[PDB]
């Protein structure tokens, strides 16, 4: 739309698009921070709306906000949460370091929309006011960190942890299914003593179980909310019950165990909870990288690699590219880079406020999307369909030199070592070398060399 509406703040008037619900401060941010393409993610917009909805409820409870205004603000916020206003949040990640401008974006959109819901209009004649009403009892300095932790905790609980559990269950099923398939071990990339395919997969399972525990340990700190610390952490200009009440209300409307931060100075001056929680996520990325690499190397072929397993072929001779493994290894690199950006932002607070916050939460929520969706994708498009190539597994095992120790108790170490050395030097199987030396019969070799007895 070309037509404009004049919106005002303490700096003066500025034109906004007539068909939009934001106000003067959103427009100034939009115009002054035309930096790349990264915007607040929907999860964070929703967390800001939840924060305003909770603040409106508590302000009404405390007699600070009229029922009529509080109810209209909560209705406007519910419209945002229902996906009706995604285009009303146009601001960049690369804005003021406190997130003030996105706080004001929510204040302006909710105020203009709440005014409409009370039979009023958007703009200067509005019935509901962004600062006096929607931002009542609040500062950008405690709202934006609150929205960061609300978005982060809900994403971990509702997306990442469920997908981690699902992938773990699938691989546990595979470990059980393949518990009796003996295969060659590999250490240093070299043929090594055998283990079962189920044992190898049980390592992946145990990795994902350990990662879940580490991620769970990080959740209580992310559950601490800054809301109520206002500008510098003292809670100046708040009711003494407000901080506990608004954390309780957020816990009610999200069904997550939010609590008010016991030290609001730590809560405002740092992103420490997110630095620590992302430490657990980069641990998961290192684990998933290893699992994804094992899968694609074991599936490599079809004839000039390892080829011990097959994976589902999802996108169009015999060349099956392990594309889910590639997407997953790529996003694991991304999580490692994101951790460095977060660490720099988290290390860079000054005095009463950390002002690297849009960048920190942009990276953090991206890592959660990547790991959650990446595990979901890898599970349904790869892991559920992993199958052994039993003939190839057996070919590699039986043509290796690593079953030779099964001969020791029968013919002695010295003759067994002689057989292995002859096989290696002359390019023979262990059986052919042993027969050539006359040290055993073929029936004895087949009776004695039992891989299923060599895996514990």
């Amino acid at each position: 739309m070309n037509t404009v509406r004049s919106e005002k703040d303490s700096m003066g008037a500025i034109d906004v698009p007539a068909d939009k619900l934001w106000g003067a401060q959103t427009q100034r941010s939009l115009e002054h921070f035309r930096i790349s393409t990264e915007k607040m993610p929907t999860s964070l917009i929703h967390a800001l709306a939840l924060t305003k909805r909770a603040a409106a409820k508590v302000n009404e409870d405390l007699g600070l906000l009229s029922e009529e205004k509080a109810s209209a603000i909560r209705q406007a916020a519910d419209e945002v949460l229902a996906g009706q206003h995604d285009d009303e949040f146009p601001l960049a990640i690369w804005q003021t370091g406190s997130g003030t401008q996105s706080n004001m974006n929510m204040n302006e959109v909710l105020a203009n929309r709440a005014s409409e819901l009370l039979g009023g209009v958007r703009g200067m004649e509005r019935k509901v006011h962004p600062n006096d009403d929607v931002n009542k009892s609040q500062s950008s300095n405690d709202v934006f960190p609150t929205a960061m932790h609300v978005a982060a905790l809900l994403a971990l609980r509702k997306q990442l942890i469920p997908q981690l559990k699902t992938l773990t269950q699938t691989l546990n099923e595979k470990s059980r299914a393949f518990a009796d398939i003996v295969k060659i071990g590999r250490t240093h990339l070299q043929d090594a003593t055998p283990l079962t395919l189920g044992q190898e997969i049980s390592g992946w399972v145990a990795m994902l179980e350990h990662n879940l525990k580490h991620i769970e340990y990080s959740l209580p700190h992310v559950a601490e909310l800054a809301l109520g610390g206002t500008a510098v952490g003292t809670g100046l200009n708040t009711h003494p019950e407000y901080a506990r009440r608004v954390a309780d209300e957020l816990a009610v409307i999200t069904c997550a165990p939010f609590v008010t931060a016991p030290n609001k100075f730590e809560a405002l001056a740092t992103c420490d909870a997110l630095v620590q929680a992302h430490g657990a996520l980069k641990g998961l990325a290192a684990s998933l990288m290893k699992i994804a690499n094992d899968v694609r190397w074991l599936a490599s072929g079809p004839r000039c690699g390892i080829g011990e397993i097959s994976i589902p072929e999802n996108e169009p001779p015999g060349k099956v590219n392990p594309t889910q493994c590639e997407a997953l290894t790529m996003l694991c690199c991304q999580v490692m880079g994101n951790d460095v950006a977060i660490n720099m932002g988290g290390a860079s607070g000054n005095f009463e406020l950390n002002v690297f916050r849009p960048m920190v939460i942009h990276n953090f929520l991206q890592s959660v999307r990547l790991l959650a969706d990446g595990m979901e994708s890898f599970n349904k498009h790869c892991a559920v369909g992993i199958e052994p190539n039993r003939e190839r597994i057996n070919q590699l095992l039986n043509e290796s030199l690593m079953l030779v120790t099964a001969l020791n108790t029968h013919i002695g170490y010295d003759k067994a070592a002689e057989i292995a050395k002859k096989a290696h030097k002359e390019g023979l199987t262990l059986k052919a070398a042993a027969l050539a030396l006359g040290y055993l019969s073929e029936a004895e070799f087949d009776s004695w060399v039992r891989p299923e007895q060599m895996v514990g």
Copy 2:
């Protein structure tokens, strides 16, 4: 649109939206890699279209593609470059690690659209074919690295370097404007011997000049193109002149000095040129971080910080938050994290192909957008308006202890040191301490203690 069109590839048929121009392989990628929200950036889509346009021209020159088809493909590509088809490229960064699926996305969209341009239709009855026509003489393995370098070199030449030069010029103007304003030095954050504000700013200028040179040194390697190496670098199934011809044609239509890579194995197996070029970008990020921090610390106040300079106040007592500095310091952290992701991807090639490519170019082009747009924003909304607070600069200088050495040649080191120690112990100015001891008159102090003689 709910209605579908059936599109086919070697795997079978799949439904695509009837109002879209992509084909079966795009649809499979869209459905199989629902991972987060990051998609190919427009710069990369354009670079893929340029690559197809150049290949079509050369294939026609070599008698391998009919004029009618080549002209229609180039027309379709020009529509993409003109911004008419942005919604036809729906694929995620987190796809196959070669970028095959986005290569096929361009092949399918250009083929379906070129078919329409020849009076045909989109879909299975098309007159122009994604693989046989649009991908003629090509592999995903040399197309996607080519598009990576085309996008990267053009972004560096057309966005980043011009904005770097502009910011450098502004700060050079400020350095000249403030060449005679003496201010207190600060080392270790402690008061130190003086320098002029122009000298201090000249350090920022020299930093940006050095960064431009480092960035320029990285451009020749990015200008090397993989196109013509086909699947593994040998150029099997290409005309012997094709690699040089298509690099020449890309140089023509982009006005940039693209050349064919002298070693196609290095070009396919690595992202080394981008690892190195991003090394120069993280150098620029470290420089810009320092410059941005100097600006916001020198502007800090209005009464309880340093306050030696003022900056433009762009968004609404006396509290001017340095929001451009905050956006810039945040994106500098992002570039550092992006470098780690790129380094991991670049270190992780195997044999004939590096398959971490969508992630590498996603990070690289993001860093270029952030640095280019961040410098553009910081320049126009902050740097052009930096002004000294001359009274505050002089207050700090004259009330410091650091002008005392101007007394040495007049009264001797021992008396000058005595004056400084008395001033420090008793909370006096140097002048008040010197007068209290009777070692000089006020006229002598004012005549002898000349900061403009202490800066070289």
Copy 3:
């Protein structure tokens, strides 16, 4: 001056006055890379692992009492600092740590032979592989030593120093609980808080970090020993893995347990990737605290200057009062180091293949360095800086009261509009808030002193 030792590749000359053997000597000619060697903590953890393995092997009837006792005595000599020069190998060796495993096997075998009345060298009475390495692989020994060194370093160095620094800052927070100062957000003047409140943020950060570090300890306490080459424990007694974890727990007094999944224990460094995540969290917190301290102490005249710190280095007599915050500089530098170390660790931890992660010397080099840096850095910062933090009460009050931030105390007395008018005239004309108020006749001097109370503005 040299003796001839042998391994399966043949004979090689070894310095007669050293206790290592042929394989260690070979490693010295093949891995001459930079200057970083195994740290003493890791050497000690390797000796503890061999000491425990010998005890359990003796318990199970696999190793004779005289050999097991001599191996334990030689290991105790290593732990007692008698053999630091017997471990010359680079970090940059075989990625499983085989060479350092064999270094310990050879030193302990040659020394145990002497303790039994024998000699070092090929006539030795105790044998590096058959005796000192019995029931073991390099594959499960080296990750065991990694976790023993890591857990003990966290328990015995880092966590005590973290608690000590926290207690110091908690005392400072209480001592300065009533000192009102100007807040700063975005580096700009902001509403007040007490110096004690500000320091209480630092304290809460260190308390949270301690919890995060504690959460990482159970996984590090899981030991690979008993998984042998690929995790199956082939050729080992079924009780060996539990017994050797129990023995390590006894002799170290730390809660070591056998890893419930030996394949995860051999194929990854996941416990250390996770534990180092908590350490880089502590580095980001310490960076912030150290930066607050040095910015608050900046000056003495052209910075903030709200606190003083101890002056530990000599200055020039003509520059009295220049106090560089050198403890803050050492601490912020090592915090950068921990962030870089984390990336190296993450790359190594992401890079296991199949049954074994072979990035292990590098991973543990970084991890133990970060622990030394953080533990020693916290000790140094505490002793030489934090214990001596003092307020500059006159400067704090000058900044607070000459600022514009106390104007909101006038709201409920003369309304928002009059108070704003006071702040703008003070700013515009360079006046104090009281001056711009008296000049506009909006209150008397006594009303200002009564209404504008910073001690009533900190919650």
Copy 4:
């Protein structure tokens, strides 16, 4: 056994048998952090900087000939390895490097005094600040020593080793130019190329890296010396900065120049952030090359096994043919280290304030470590692995010809459809391409041998 030395804080006991003074002794009690000290390269660069400053100060008539000569002689003793134990200070010190600057001033002053027939200690004839530090600040000395050490290490260690490894791999590429092998993309069988072509990719990578490293050298050659405390050169001779850069260029034979902007030179570590960017590029290239080598050598029976590498470590007689790629492991580990070091450097380089970057000991510790790792790692990988790479010609040909990838050679002879039909039956039934072709009667044995030529499929 001790002597009493003094600085402006008073007297302190110093070991009588050491050459440092009061300030170095104080640093030893205040910076007891971890184990990392200044590396020898940096100590030598500091001694060279003092040697050059003394020469120029003598030229300008500021320092007596006998003192300047004695200082230069003492510096030459440091360069000759006679005083390594006189530099005990941690990396984790004052962020300007003041303490190590004073360490060199005190050692050279005390030793120069002895060379003049005097003694060490407070009766010395040569004075650490007035003589050895004349015309200098820690602020411009330490960045000068950083760049001297960095440039010389790149010129004298890293670049020679890079060239040596490149030449070895170039010889291997030519030697194996006619050996056709199976390509691999996405880890999957792909169309053929020669082993020489594959190795030529490694060579081209190392050649490109050399160019990138060379591009970083001019900025590192810019020296801060002459900027003194804040960059203005206050209290220095107008020719001093050029003269001392010229003198360093003479005595090192390297193209040092005075930094054209001393404020950039003092306030940043930008040259080293940029130069380390090229080193992490080399680390990513070396990681890839090392991984190709160890994957291509994997086996001996259940991996790829296309090449053999030297076996440098002993194995077990019952496991012949297990050759761990231990040089590849050391090299990939140190490449991870370089990536982490880059992050530490970037954080330090981003963190200057106003006139001085005070993250410098940490920055140069990382930078010089990366140079040692890459130079020594390339030397080790070359000598103990790359020079011995050989093809397993039978295995290469087995993989190539038992694969499905040569089927496209049949296209122009029997059409696309028949060739595809051959590949699918071979895959479906586990046949060779020739077997599935003869079985379907689409060609004779002689037509297959004539048509399917891998040596005609590599461009």
